[PDB]
Amino acid sequence: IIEFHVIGNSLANRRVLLWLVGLQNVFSHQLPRMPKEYIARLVFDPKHKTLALIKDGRVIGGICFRMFPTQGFTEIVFCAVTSNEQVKGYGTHLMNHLKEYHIKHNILYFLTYADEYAIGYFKKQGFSKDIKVPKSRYLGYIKDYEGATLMECELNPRIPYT
Amino acid sequence: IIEFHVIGNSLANRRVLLWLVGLQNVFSHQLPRMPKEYIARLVFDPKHKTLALIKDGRVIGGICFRMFPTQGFTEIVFCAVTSNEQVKGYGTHLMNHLKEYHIKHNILYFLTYADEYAIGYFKKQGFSKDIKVPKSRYLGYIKDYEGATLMECELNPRIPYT
Amino acid sequence: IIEFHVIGNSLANRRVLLWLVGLQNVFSHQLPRMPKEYIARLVFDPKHKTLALIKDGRVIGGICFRMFPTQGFTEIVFCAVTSNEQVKGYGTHLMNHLKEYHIKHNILYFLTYADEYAIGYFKKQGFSKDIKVPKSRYLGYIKDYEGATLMECELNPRIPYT
Amino acid sequence: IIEFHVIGNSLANRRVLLWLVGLQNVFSHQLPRMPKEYIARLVFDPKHKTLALIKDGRVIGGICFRMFPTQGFTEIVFCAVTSNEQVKGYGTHLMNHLKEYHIKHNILYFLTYADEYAIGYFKKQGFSKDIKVPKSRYLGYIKDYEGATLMECELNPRIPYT
Amino acid sequence: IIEFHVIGNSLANRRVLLWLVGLQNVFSHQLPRMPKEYIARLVFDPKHKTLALIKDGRVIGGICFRMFPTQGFTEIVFCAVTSNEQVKGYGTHLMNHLKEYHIKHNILYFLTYADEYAIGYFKKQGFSKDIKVPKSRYLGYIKDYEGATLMECELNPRIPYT
Amino acid sequence: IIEFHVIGNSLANRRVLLWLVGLQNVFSHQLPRMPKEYIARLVFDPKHKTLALIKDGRVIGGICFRMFPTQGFTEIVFCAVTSNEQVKGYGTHLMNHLKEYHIKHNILYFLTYADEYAIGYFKKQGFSKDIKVPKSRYLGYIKDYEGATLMECELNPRIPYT
Amino acid sequence: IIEFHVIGNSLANRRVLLWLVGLQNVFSHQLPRMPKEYIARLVFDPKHKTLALIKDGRVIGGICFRMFPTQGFTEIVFCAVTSNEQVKGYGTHLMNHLKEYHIKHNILYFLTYADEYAIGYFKKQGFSKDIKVPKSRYLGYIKDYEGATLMECELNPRIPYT
Amino acid sequence: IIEFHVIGNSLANRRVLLWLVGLQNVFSHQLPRMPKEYIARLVFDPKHKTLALIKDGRVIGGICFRMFPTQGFTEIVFCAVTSNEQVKGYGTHLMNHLKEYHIKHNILYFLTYADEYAIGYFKKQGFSKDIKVPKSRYLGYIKDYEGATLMECELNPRIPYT
Ligand SMILES: C[C@@H](O)C(=O)SCCNC(=O)CCNC(=O)[C@H](O)C(C)(C)COP(=O)(O)OP(=O)(O)OC[C@H]1O[C@@H](n2cnc3c(N)ncnc32)[C@H](O)[C@@H]1OP(=O)(O)O
Ligand SMILES: C[C@@H](O)C(=O)SCCNC(=O)CCNC(=O)[C@H](O)C(C)(C)COP(=O)(O)OP(=O)(O)OC[C@H]1O[C@@H](n2cnc3c(N)ncnc32)[C@H](O)[C@@H]1OP(=O)(O)O
Ligand SMILES: C[C@@H](O)C(=O)SCCNC(=O)CCNC(=O)[C@H](O)C(C)(C)COP(=O)(O)OP(=O)(O)OC[C@H]1O[C@@H](n2cnc3c(N)ncnc32)[C@H](O)[C@@H]1OP(=O)(O)O
Ligand SMILES: C[C@@H](O)C(=O)SCCNC(=O)CCNC(=O)[C@H](O)C(C)(C)COP(=O)(O)OP(=O)(O)OC[C@H]1O[C@@H](n2cnc3c(N)ncnc32)[C@H](O)[C@@H]1OP(=O)(O)O
Ligand SMILES: C[C@@H](O)C(=O)SCCNC(=O)CCNC(=O)[C@H](O)C(C)(C)COP(=O)(O)OP(=O)(O)OC[C@H]1O[C@@H](n2cnc3c(N)ncnc32)[C@H](O)[C@@H]1OP(=O)(O)O
Ligand SMILES: C[C@@H](O)C(=O)SCCNC(=O)CCNC(=O)[C@H](O)C(C)(C)COP(=O)(O)OP(=O)(O)OC[C@H]1O[C@@H](n2cnc3c(N)ncnc32)[C@H](O)[C@@H]1OP(=O)(O)O
Ligand SMILES: C[C@@H](O)C(=O)SCCNC(=O)CCNC(=O)[C@H](O)C(C)(C)COP(=O)(O)OP(=O)(O)OC[C@H]1O[C@@H](n2cnc3c(N)ncnc32)[C@H](O)[C@@H]1OP(=O)(O)O
Ligand SMILES: C[C@@H](O)C(=O)SCCNC(=O)CCNC(=O)[C@H](O)C(C)(C)COP(=O)(O)OP(=O)(O)OC[C@H]1O[C@@H](n2cnc3c(N)ncnc32)[C@H](O)[C@@H]1OP(=O)(O)O
C-alpha cells in the first residue's frame, strides 16, 4: 500500500513522469508562495531528486532535494504531504527514509531554509539553527531565502533510520 | 514573441516536458472541476496532442486534442488561456491554428462536450449543437460528459484560417 | 498476499504459463457448461488477456477479456473465483481492477453475455441491459450467446476504482 | 490420400503455384458463367486465400475466400469440386474445414452470393437468407451480384467442425 | 486419423501448448486424487515429456514420463485415455510406442508406482513387481508414493513393438 | 516487509554481496563453534547457495545449502535466525520456502548433521534419524561431522509448503 | 529584428564565427584600454561564453562571461554596446537575459571588476560593493584588476527577468 | 610469509573477496562498539580501500581508509590487528606501508578520530591533536565522532617509510 521511490527526470518513463507531475502538483498546493514554474523547473531539473511517497499507486507526499556530494551536504528544496493525509507520520517517515538513503551515500548533513510556518516540523526532524557547515561551503550553492531561517541536520551513519 | 507548437509525450524534450507541465498547470487552474490527475494523464497520453501557445518562451495557453483519423474527426479535450492573457484573441488564434493544422491532415470535423459556461466560446468558434457525424462513429471514442452539450465544428478545407 | 497481474500468451513465461493453466482449470470448473478446449483456446489466444487474482502465489480467480480498441469496447469472456474463495469481495475487486486498467487504455465500455445465474453479479458490478454501443459496432466482434442477454457497463475515466 | 491446405499468392511455392493453376482451372470449368480471367485474378490476388482439397497430390476442389477481419466476416468467392469427385461429401468437408479455420481466427460470419443453382448447397451448409451483419458493414466490401441471393452463415466457436 | 507425438514444454508451439493443456485436463480428470497443479507442474516441466495420442487433431490420451539417461531408466508419471476412448487398445498402443521410442534412445527399463486400481493395466503391459534396478539407482530420482507398489518393465532392444 | 531470496556468489550484486556478508555474520554469531573462515568460504562458494530472509532490507536469517542434483538430495550447511527475530516462526518459514524451492527442482531429500542442541529443531521440520538415502550416495558428498547425528527429510511434491 | 544567442568557440560555424569577430571588434572599440589580443584570447577561449545581441543579423552588443559552476558564480568579463546604439536599453536587456540564463543553470551570483567609468551601470543592474561570496571562493578564479572595484549581483531564481 | 595488498570492492575475485570478509570480521571483533553492518558497509564501499595484512594467505590485520584527493587528505576509518598477533609491530608496519602508499599518491595528510583506548597508538604513529587541515576542508567529509579526539598525521614525501 505504501511505497518509497527516489525518482527524478533523467537525461523517465510514464509512471515516473506522472509521479513527478503529481509531486509538482502537491508542492504547488502545499507551498502557494512558491511559483509553480519554479517548482516545476526544480522538480524536473536533472541535478534534483525527489523521494516520492506512493499510496496505492498515487503520490501523496515527497521531499525534493539537491545533493552536493563535492560540498558534503544535501539541500532540502521542497517538503510536502497532501492535505488530507497530513498529521499521520508520513512527513517523519519521508525524512527518515531520506536520512537512510543519504548515509548510504555518505552524505551526513542536510541544509534548508524554513519560514515560520515550517520551522517546527524541522526541529522535530532533528534540524537546528546552529550551523556547523561553514558559510564558505554552502553560500552560493544552496538557494538563499531572505527572512527565512537556515537550518541544519547532522546524520549519524551508525544508526538505522528506517 | 508568440509561438504555436503541436507537442506531446511520445513512445527540446526537456523544454517540451516543462511546456507539458505548464499546460497541465494552466488546464488544471482554468478547469478546476476537472481532476488534476485526469488532466495530467491525458496531457501526457501518447495518443493525445496539445497545441501550445508560447509567449516569450512560457506557456500561456493550449488546446489538448485527440485525433481519430480512422473515424474522420478530432476530439477537443481541454482548452485554456491563462487569466492574464484572456480576452486578447488568443483562444480564437489557438482554435484557428488548430483548424489549419487539421485541414493539412484531411480531418474536417471537431467534436467536444461543452458545459453551460463554455458553450458560448465554442459557438463563437463555429461549433454547433447539430451533429452531422453519426453516433455510431463517435460513441465510445470521444469521452462522454453527461449533462454537457455535444458540439461539432465542420472545417472548410478551401478557406485559409491563419 | 494478494496481487493482480494482466497476463496472457504472448508471441511465454513458466510462472505465467502455470497461472494460465490454473486459470483454464478454474474457469472450466466454475463454468462446467463451457467446453474445456474452448476455454483453453481463448485463454491461450494472443488477442485475449486475463487479469489473474493471485493469493500466496497460486491462482484463485481471474477475468478473461478481449480488448477491441478499434471498436471502442472490451468483451468480457470468463469470470471465475475458486469455490472456496467466493463471497469475499474477490470478484468485485477483480472487476474494479479491470475497470482501472481500461481507463488507462481509454476503453470505457464493457460488453458481455450473462447467464440467468450470472446476470445478478454483473448488475452489482454496474452492468445494465441498456446497451449504448450500436449493434453495427459489436455484432460479429463479441461472441454471441443465443438465449443469454447482452449487458453493458460504461466507465467514468475521471473516477478511481482501486 | 486427402489433404487440405490454405494457400495463396503472396508479396513448395512451385507446387503451390500449380495448385493455384489447378484451382483456377477447376473453378473456371465448374463456374462457366464466370470470366476465366476474373477467376485467375482473384485466385492469385494477395488479399485472397484458397482452401485447396488435394487428393493424391492433385487439386480436386477448393474454396476461394477473402477474409475481412476488420469487418468481422469472410467473403466466400468460389466453391467447386471437380465433376468426378462430386457427391462424395468433399464440398461438405471443405466447408467444415473452412469453418474450423475461421473459428481459430475469431471470424464467425460467412457472407456469399448464391445464384438459383447454388442456393441449395449453401442451405445445407447452414447458410441463411436472413442477414444479421449490417449492410453498413459489408456493402462495398463483398462483391455484389445483382439478381443473386445474399447468404449468411454464423459459426459457433464452441462446436467442433472437423 | 490417429498420430503419436512426443511433445513437451521446451526452453513452445501453440498447437503443442493446447495439446499439453488437453493432456493436463485429461490426466486430471482420469486421476482425480492427483492435485491438478501438481499434474500441471510436471506436464510443463522441461525435464518431462508426454507421448500424446491425437485422434482427429484433439488429445484423447497420453503418457507423461521422465527420462533418466544417466540412471538407465525412465519413470512413468501419468497414463490416461479419455473415458469415451477407453477399452479400445489405445492404452496398449501408447505403451508400445513409448517402448519403441526408448529403444532408439537405449533406455531399456521403465519404473512406476501403480495403484491397486492401475496395477492390473501395468501387469498387462509387461510390468512386474520384481525390480531389477537397484534401490541405490532409483531412490531419490523417481517420485515415491507411499502405499503404492513399485513396478518395473524391461525392454528387449532386438524386438519391434510397433 | 518480509522477503526471501535465493542468492550466492557466482562465476543488485553489491546488495547481494552485503547480504552474503550479513549472512556470514549471522551464521558466525549463531554457530560460534564453527570457524568464521569456514563459514565465509562456504557462504561464498560457487556451488553453495543461501536462502536469505530479508526484513526491511536487512538480513535477519538464512539457510545455506549445497544442491547435489546428480545424487538426488541437498545438503543443509547452515541454518540461523538472528537472536532478536527468533521464536517468531522465521526458522519454520525459512525451511518451508526451501522445501517449496526444491520441489520445483525435483529434489525431494534433505540431508544434514545436527548436534545435540539442534536435533530438536530439525525434528520439528520433519527430519528423521532414519536415512533412506543409501550411504553410497551421500558419503564423500555431504561434509561429515563425527559425533553429530545424520538427519534426513523427505519432501512430498504434491503438498504445498508456502 | 532583435535576437539573443549564447555563443562561443567550441572544441563553430561561420555565422557564429563572424559574430565572435564582431563581438571582439565591439569590445575593442568600447574598451580601448583592454589589449585586443587579450579580448580576442578570452572571447575565443572555450571556457568563456558570450551572450550576443543581434540586430538584423549584425552584432550590436554582448556580454562575455566565465561560468564557475563548481565555485557557484559567474565572472563578468566584457560588457559593451556599439556606440550609436547605446542609451537605448540594450545594456539592461543584455544583463536581464544573462540573469535569466543563469538562474536556469542554478548559478545565482555575478562577480565583476568595474572601473570608475563603469560602476554606475552595474549599480543600475543591481550590483553592489558588498561582497557576499567569500574571498577564498573567488580569489585566483576571477581576474583581479588593481584599482578597480569588485562588485557582486545576487540573482533571485523565483523571479522572471525577461 | 608476510604480504601487503591495497584491496577493495570494485564496481573483485574470490581470494580478495574472502580477504575483505576476513577484514570485516577482524574489525568487528577488535571494534565491538562499531556496528558490524556499518563496518561491512564501509569495507565494501567502492570509495573505501583497505590495506590488508596477509600472513601465509590469511588476513591478520588491516587499515580501512577513505582517500579524499580533491580535499588533500585521507580519513583513517578502521585499524585492527587480530588478538593473538598484536604487540608485534604489525600495527606500525601497516601504518608505515599506508604512509608510503600515500606519498606515492601525493596525499600527505591523515585524519582520524581516536577514542581513549586508541589515542596512544596514533601518537606513536606520529599523529597529533594539533590539526593543520582547516575545518572548512574536512568537516562533512570525514565522519565525526562526538567525544572522540580528532588527530592528524603529516607525511614527509622525501622520506622512505618501508
Ligand atoms: C520552506 C521550504 O523552502 C522548505 O524547506 S520545504 C517546505 C515546507 N513546508 C511545508 O511542508 C508546508 C506544508 N506542510 C506539509 O505538507 C506537512 O504538514 C509537513 C510539513 C510535510 C509535515 O508532514 P506530516 O503532516 O505528514 O507530518 P507528521 O505526521 O510526521 O507530523 C509532524 C510532526 O511535527 C509537528 N509539527 C510542528 N510544526 C509543524 C509544522 N509546521 N508542520 C507540520 N508538522 C509540524 C506535528 O505536531 C507533528 O509532531 P507531534 O504531533 O508528533 O509532536
Ligand atoms: C472538454 C471541454 O470542457 C473543453 O474543451 S474545456 C474549454 C473551456 N475552457 C474554459 O472555460 C477555461 C477558462 N476559459 C478560458 O481559458 C478562456 O476564457 C477561453 C475559453 C480559452 C477563451 O479564450 P480567450 O479568453 O483568449 O478568448 P478570445 O480573446 O479569443 O475571445 C473569445 C470570444 O468569445 C467570447 N466568449 C463567449 N462566451 C465565452 C466563454 N464561455 N469563454 C470564453 N470566451 C467566451 C469572448 O467574449 C470573446 O468574444 P468576442 O470578443 O470575439 O465577441
Ligand atoms: C459473462 C460470462 O461469459 C462470464 O464471464 S462468467 C461470469 C460468471 N461466473 C460464474 O458464474 C462462475 C462461478 N461463480 C464465481 O466464480 C463467483 O460467484 C463470482 C461472482 C464470479 C466471483 O465473485 P465473488 O464470488 O468473489 O463475489 P463478491 O464477493 O465479489 O460479490 C458477491 C456479491 O454479488 C452478489 N451476487 C448477485 N448475483 C450473484 C451471482 N449470480 N453470483 C455471485 N454473486 C452474485 C452477491 O449477493 C454479493 O452481493 P453483496 O455481498 O455485495 O451484497
Ligand atoms: C460466389 C458463389 O457463386 C460461389 O461461391 S460459387 C459456389 C457454387 N459452385 C458450383 O455450383 C460449382 C459446381 N458444383 C460443385 O462444384 C459441387 O456440386 C459443390 C457445389 C461444390 C458441392 O460439392 P459436392 O458435390 O462434393 O457436395 P457434397 O457431396 O458435400 O454434398 C452436398 C450436399 O448438398 C446437396 N445439394 C443441394 N443443392 C446442391 C447444389 N446446388 N450443388 C451441390 N450440392 C447440392 C447435395 O445433394 C448433397 O446433399 P446431401 O447428400 O448432404 O443431402
Ligand atoms: C503409474 C501412475 O502414476 C500412472 O501413470 S496412472 C496409470 C493409470 N491410469 C488411470 O487409471 C487413468 C484412468 N484409466 C485410463 O485412462 C485407462 O483405463 C487406461 C488403462 C490408462 C488406458 O488404457 P485403455 O483403457 O485404452 O486400455 P486398453 O484397451 O489399451 O487395454 C485394456 C486391457 O487392460 C486390462 N486391464 C487390467 N487392469 C486394468 C485397469 N486397472 N484399467 C484398465 N485396463 C485394465 C483390461 O482387462 C484389458 O485387457 P485385454 O482386453 O487386453 O484382455
Ligand atoms: C549443519 C548444521 O549444524 C546446521 O544446519 S546449523 C542449524 C542450527 N542452528 C542453530 O542452532 C543456530 C541458533 N538457532 C537459531 O538460529 C534458531 O533458534 C533456529 C534453529 C534457526 C530456529 O529458528 P526460529 O527460532 O525462528 O524457530 P521458529 O520460531 O520457526 O520455531 C521453531 C520451533 O522449533 C522448536 N525448537 C525445538 N528445539 C529447537 C532448537 N534446538 N532450536 C530452535 N528451535 C527449536 C521451537 O521451540 C519452535 O517450536 P514450536 O513453537 O513450533 O513448537
Ligand atoms: C570594466 C570591465 O572589466 C567590465 O566589467 S565590462 C566593461 C564595461 N565598460 C563598458 O561597457 C564601457 C562601454 N559602455 C557601453 O558599451 C555601454 O554604455 C554599456 C555600459 C554597456 C551600457 O549599455 P547601454 O548604453 O545600452 O545601457 P542602457 O541603455 O540599458 O542604459 C544604461 C543605464 O545606466 C545608466 N548608467 C550609469 N552609469 C553608466 C555608465 N557608465 N555606462 C552606461 N550607462 C550608465 C544610464 O544613465 C542608463 O540609466 P537610466 O538613464 O535609465 O537612469
Ligand atoms: C577509533 C577508530 O575510529 C579508528 O580511528 S581505528 C580503531 C582503532 N582501534 C583499535 O585498533 C583497537 C584494537 N587494537 C588493535 O587492533 C591493535 O592493538 C592496534 C591498535 C592496531 C595496534 O597494532 P599492534 O598491536 O600490532 O601494534 P604494534 O605491535 O605496532 O605496537 C603498538 C605500539 O603502540 C603502543 N600503544 C600505545 N597505546 C596503544 C593502544 N591503544 N593500542 C595499541 N598499541 C598501543 C604499544 O605499546 C606499542 O608501542 P611500544 O611498545 O613500541 O612503545
PDB file of N, CA and C and ligand atoms in Angstrom, chain B residues 30-31 34 76-82 85-94 112-122 124-125 145, ligand 2:
ATOM      1  N   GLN B  30      -7.565  26.574 -14.880  1.00  0.00           N
ATOM      2  CA  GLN B  30      -8.701  27.105 -15.626  1.00  0.00           C
ATOM      3  C   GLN B  30      -9.886  26.150 -15.670  1.00  0.00           C
ATOM      4  N   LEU B  31      -9.676  24.865 -15.382  1.00  0.00           N
ATOM      5  CA  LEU B  31     -10.743  23.866 -15.375  1.00  0.00           C
ATOM      6  C   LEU B  31     -10.772  23.199 -14.004  1.00  0.00           C
ATOM      7  N   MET B  34     -12.235  19.732 -13.188  1.00  0.00           N
ATOM      8  CA  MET B  34     -11.542  18.570 -13.731  1.00  0.00           C
ATOM      9  C   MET B  34     -10.533  18.056 -12.706  1.00  0.00           C
ATOM     10  N   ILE B  76     -11.760  17.469 -29.020  1.00  0.00           N
ATOM     11  CA  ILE B  76     -11.125  18.558 -28.287  1.00  0.00           C
ATOM     12  C   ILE B  76     -11.264  18.260 -26.799  1.00  0.00           C
ATOM     13  N   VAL B  77     -10.131  18.098 -26.125  1.00  0.00           N
ATOM     14  CA  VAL B  77     -10.096  17.580 -24.760  1.00  0.00           C
ATOM     15  C   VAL B  77     -10.045  18.702 -23.732  1.00  0.00           C
ATOM     16  N   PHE B  78      -9.121  19.651 -23.895  1.00  0.00           N
ATOM     17  CA  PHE B  78      -9.012  20.795 -22.998  1.00  0.00           C
ATOM     18  C   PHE B  78      -8.679  22.044 -23.803  1.00  0.00           C
ATOM     19  N   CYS B  79      -9.303  23.163 -23.436  1.00  0.00           N
ATOM     20  CA  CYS B  79      -8.987  24.476 -23.987  1.00  0.00           C
ATOM     21  C   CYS B  79      -8.818  25.439 -22.825  1.00  0.00           C
ATOM     22  N   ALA B  80      -7.725  26.200 -22.827  1.00  0.00           N
ATOM     23  CA  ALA B  80      -7.489  27.140 -21.740  1.00  0.00           C
ATOM     24  C   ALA B  80      -6.478  28.193 -22.166  1.00  0.00           C
ATOM     25  N   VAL B  81      -6.694  29.412 -21.684  1.00  0.00           N
ATOM     26  CA  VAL B  81      -5.729  30.501 -21.755  1.00  0.00           C
ATOM     27  C   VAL B  81      -5.590  31.065 -20.349  1.00  0.00           C
ATOM     28  N   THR B  82      -4.353  31.329 -19.932  1.00  0.00           N
ATOM     29  CA  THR B  82      -4.126  31.834 -18.584  1.00  0.00           C
ATOM     30  C   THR B  82      -4.843  33.167 -18.387  1.00  0.00           C
ATOM     31  N   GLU B  85      -3.822  36.562 -19.798  1.00  0.00           N
ATOM     32  CA  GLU B  85      -3.759  36.666 -21.250  1.00  0.00           C
ATOM     33  C   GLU B  85      -5.114  36.444 -21.911  1.00  0.00           C
ATOM     34  N   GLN B  86      -6.193  36.416 -21.135  1.00  0.00           N
ATOM     35  CA  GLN B  86      -7.511  36.178 -21.696  1.00  0.00           C
ATOM     36  C   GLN B  86      -8.088  37.461 -22.290  1.00  0.00           C
ATOM     37  N   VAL B  87      -9.086  37.281 -23.160  1.00  0.00           N
ATOM     38  CA  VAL B  87      -9.799  38.369 -23.825  1.00  0.00           C
ATOM     39  C   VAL B  87      -8.811  39.196 -24.642  1.00  0.00           C
ATOM     40  N   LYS B  88      -7.807  38.530 -25.210  1.00  0.00           N
ATOM     41  CA  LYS B  88      -6.895  39.151 -26.160  1.00  0.00           C
ATOM     42  C   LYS B  88      -6.953  38.510 -27.539  1.00  0.00           C
ATOM     43  N   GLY B  89      -7.830  37.530 -27.748  1.00  0.00           N
ATOM     44  CA  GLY B  89      -7.912  36.829 -29.011  1.00  0.00           C
ATOM     45  C   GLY B  89      -7.093  35.560 -29.095  1.00  0.00           C
ATOM     46  N   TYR B  90      -6.385  35.188 -28.024  1.00  0.00           N
ATOM     47  CA  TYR B  90      -5.525  34.009 -28.077  1.00  0.00           C
ATOM     48  C   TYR B  90      -6.339  32.728 -28.217  1.00  0.00           C
ATOM     49  N   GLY B  91      -7.468  32.638 -27.512  1.00  0.00           N
ATOM     50  CA  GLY B  91      -8.342  31.490 -27.674  1.00  0.00           C
ATOM     51  C   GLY B  91      -8.854  31.334 -29.093  1.00  0.00           C
ATOM     52  N   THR B  92      -9.111  32.453 -29.777  1.00  0.00           N
ATOM     53  CA  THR B  92      -9.528  32.400 -31.176  1.00  0.00           C
ATOM     54  C   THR B  92      -8.356  32.039 -32.082  1.00  0.00           C
ATOM     55  N   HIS B  93      -7.180  32.624 -31.829  1.00  0.00           N
ATOM     56  CA  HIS B  93      -5.998  32.282 -32.612  1.00  0.00           C
ATOM     57  C   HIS B  93      -5.573  30.836 -32.385  1.00  0.00           C
ATOM     58  N   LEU B  94      -5.759  30.320 -31.168  1.00  0.00           N
ATOM     59  CA  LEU B  94      -5.457  28.918 -30.900  1.00  0.00           C
ATOM     60  C   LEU B  94      -6.355  28.004 -31.725  1.00  0.00           C
ATOM     61  N   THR B 112     -16.633  17.968 -29.375  1.00  0.00           N
ATOM     62  CA  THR B 112     -16.319  18.286 -27.989  1.00  0.00           C
ATOM     63  C   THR B 112     -17.609  18.345 -27.184  1.00  0.00           C
ATOM     64  N   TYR B 113     -17.455  18.287 -25.865  1.00  0.00           N
ATOM     65  CA  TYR B 113     -18.555  18.463 -24.927  1.00  0.00           C
ATOM     66  C   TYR B 113     -18.314  19.749 -24.150  1.00  0.00           C
ATOM     67  N   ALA B 114     -19.263  20.674 -24.229  1.00  0.00           N
ATOM     68  CA  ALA B 114     -19.157  21.967 -23.569  1.00  0.00           C
ATOM     69  C   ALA B 114     -20.217  22.066 -22.483  1.00  0.00           C
ATOM     70  N   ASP B 115     -19.805  22.452 -21.277  1.00  0.00           N
ATOM     71  CA  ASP B 115     -20.790  22.705 -20.241  1.00  0.00           C
ATOM     72  C   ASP B 115     -21.425  24.078 -20.460  1.00  0.00           C
ATOM     73  N   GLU B 116     -22.291  24.472 -19.525  1.00  0.00           N
ATOM     74  CA  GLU B 116     -23.073  25.689 -19.705  1.00  0.00           C
ATOM     75  C   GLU B 116     -22.190  26.930 -19.781  1.00  0.00           C
ATOM     76  N   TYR B 117     -21.032  26.914 -19.119  1.00  0.00           N
ATOM     77  CA  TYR B 117     -20.158  28.081 -19.118  1.00  0.00           C
ATOM     78  C   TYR B 117     -19.305  28.195 -20.376  1.00  0.00           C
ATOM     79  N   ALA B 118     -19.055  27.090 -21.083  1.00  0.00           N
ATOM     80  CA  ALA B 118     -18.140  27.102 -22.219  1.00  0.00           C
ATOM     81  C   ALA B 118     -18.838  27.078 -23.574  1.00  0.00           C
ATOM     82  N   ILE B 119     -20.149  26.822 -23.612  1.00  0.00           N
ATOM     83  CA  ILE B 119     -20.862  26.711 -24.884  1.00  0.00           C
ATOM     84  C   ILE B 119     -20.670  27.967 -25.723  1.00  0.00           C
ATOM     85  N   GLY B 120     -20.705  29.136 -25.078  1.00  0.00           N
ATOM     86  CA  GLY B 120     -20.648  30.388 -25.818  1.00  0.00           C
ATOM     87  C   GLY B 120     -19.343  30.585 -26.566  1.00  0.00           C
ATOM     88  N   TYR B 121     -18.227  30.149 -25.974  1.00  0.00           N
ATOM     89  CA  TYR B 121     -16.942  30.263 -26.660  1.00  0.00           C
ATOM     90  C   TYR B 121     -16.897  29.374 -27.897  1.00  0.00           C
ATOM     91  N   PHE B 122     -17.413  28.146 -27.791  1.00  0.00           N
ATOM     92  CA  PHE B 122     -17.407  27.244 -28.937  1.00  0.00           C
ATOM     93  C   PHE B 122     -18.348  27.720 -30.035  1.00  0.00           C
ATOM     94  N   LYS B 124     -18.848  30.842 -30.801  1.00  0.00           N
ATOM     95  CA  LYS B 124     -18.093  31.882 -31.490  1.00  0.00           C
ATOM     96  C   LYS B 124     -16.965  31.317 -32.344  1.00  0.00           C
ATOM     97  N   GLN B 125     -16.569  30.065 -32.120  1.00  0.00           N
ATOM     98  CA  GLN B 125     -15.564  29.411 -32.947  1.00  0.00           C
ATOM     99  C   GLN B 125     -16.179  28.548 -34.041  1.00  0.00           C
ATOM    100  N   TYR B 145     -19.556  13.314 -21.480  1.00  0.00           N
ATOM    101  CA  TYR B 145     -19.829  14.029 -20.236  1.00  0.00           C
ATOM    102  C   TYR B 145     -21.337  14.218 -20.139  1.00  0.00           C
TER     103      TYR B 145
HETATM  104  C1  LIG I   2     -13.860  19.451 -22.875  1.00  0.00           C
HETATM  105  C2  LIG I   2     -14.299  20.883 -22.718  1.00  0.00           C
HETATM  106  O1  LIG I   2     -14.715  21.106 -21.379  1.00  0.00           O
HETATM  107  C3  LIG I   2     -13.170  21.833 -23.108  1.00  0.00           C
HETATM  108  O2  LIG I   2     -12.634  21.849 -24.186  1.00  0.00           O
HETATM  109  S1  LIG I   2     -12.710  22.955 -21.856  1.00  0.00           S
HETATM  110  C4  LIG I   2     -12.778  24.522 -22.767  1.00  0.00           C
HETATM  111  C5  LIG I   2     -13.349  25.599 -21.867  1.00  0.00           C
HETATM  112  N1  LIG I   2     -12.292  26.198 -21.069  1.00  0.00           N
HETATM  113  C6  LIG I   2     -12.527  27.134 -20.157  1.00  0.00           C
HETATM  114  O3  LIG I   2     -13.649  27.583 -19.940  1.00  0.00           O
HETATM  115  C7  LIG I   2     -11.317  27.615 -19.397  1.00  0.00           C
HETATM  116  C8  LIG I   2     -11.482  29.032 -18.905  1.00  0.00           C
HETATM  117  N2  LIG I   2     -11.553  29.985 -20.002  1.00  0.00           N
HETATM  118  C9  LIG I   2     -10.507  30.258 -20.786  1.00  0.00           C
HETATM  119  O4  LIG I   2      -9.410  29.722 -20.653  1.00  0.00           O
HETATM  120  C10 LIG I   2     -10.733  31.292 -21.878  1.00  0.00           C
HETATM  121  O5  LIG I   2     -11.741  32.195 -21.455  1.00  0.00           O
HETATM  122  C11 LIG I   2     -11.099  30.676 -23.253  1.00  0.00           C
HETATM  123  C12 LIG I   2     -12.398  29.870 -23.139  1.00  0.00           C
HETATM  124  C13 LIG I   2      -9.966  29.757 -23.725  1.00  0.00           C
HETATM  125  C14 LIG I   2     -11.290  31.784 -24.282  1.00  0.00           C
HETATM  126  O6  LIG I   2     -10.016  32.320 -24.663  1.00  0.00           O
HETATM  127  P1  LIG I   2      -9.802  33.897 -24.722  1.00  0.00           P
HETATM  128  O7  LIG I   2     -10.297  34.473 -23.453  1.00  0.00           O
HETATM  129  O8  LIG I   2      -8.416  34.186 -25.158  1.00  0.00           O
HETATM  130  O9  LIG I   2     -10.811  34.285 -25.901  1.00  0.00           O
HETATM  131  P2  LIG I   2     -10.664  35.322 -27.109  1.00  0.00           P
HETATM  132  O10 LIG I   2      -9.976  36.528 -26.600  1.00  0.00           O
HETATM  133  O11 LIG I   2     -10.107  34.611 -28.283  1.00  0.00           O
HETATM  134  O12 LIG I   2     -12.186  35.704 -27.398  1.00  0.00           O
HETATM  135  C15 LIG I   2     -13.229  34.713 -27.285  1.00  0.00           C
HETATM  136  C16 LIG I   2     -14.545  35.352 -27.651  1.00  0.00           C
HETATM  137  O13 LIG I   2     -15.632  34.506 -27.201  1.00  0.00           O
HETATM  138  C17 LIG I   2     -16.399  35.213 -26.240  1.00  0.00           C
HETATM  139  N3  LIG I   2     -16.953  34.269 -25.275  1.00  0.00           N
HETATM  140  C18 LIG I   2     -18.281  33.973 -25.104  1.00  0.00           C
HETATM  141  N4  LIG I   2     -18.513  33.056 -24.199  1.00  0.00           N
HETATM  142  C19 LIG I   2     -17.249  32.721 -23.737  1.00  0.00           C
HETATM  143  C20 LIG I   2     -16.806  31.797 -22.773  1.00  0.00           C
HETATM  144  N5  LIG I   2     -17.619  30.988 -22.087  1.00  0.00           N
HETATM  145  N6  LIG I   2     -15.476  31.709 -22.555  1.00  0.00           N
HETATM  146  C21 LIG I   2     -14.654  32.492 -23.262  1.00  0.00           C
HETATM  147  N7  LIG I   2     -14.956  33.396 -24.197  1.00  0.00           N
HETATM  148  C22 LIG I   2     -16.277  33.463 -24.392  1.00  0.00           C
HETATM  149  C23 LIG I   2     -15.466  36.278 -25.677  1.00  0.00           C
HETATM  150  O14 LIG I   2     -16.207  37.348 -25.100  1.00  0.00           O
HETATM  151  C24 LIG I   2     -14.807  36.702 -26.982  1.00  0.00           C
HETATM  152  O15 LIG I   2     -15.859  37.255 -27.800  1.00  0.00           O
HETATM  153  P3  LIG I   2     -15.650  38.376 -28.960  1.00  0.00           P
HETATM  154  O16 LIG I   2     -14.837  39.494 -28.346  1.00  0.00           O
HETATM  155  O17 LIG I   2     -14.934  37.676 -30.096  1.00  0.00           O
HETATM  156  O18 LIG I   2     -17.056  38.801 -29.330  1.00  0.00           O
END
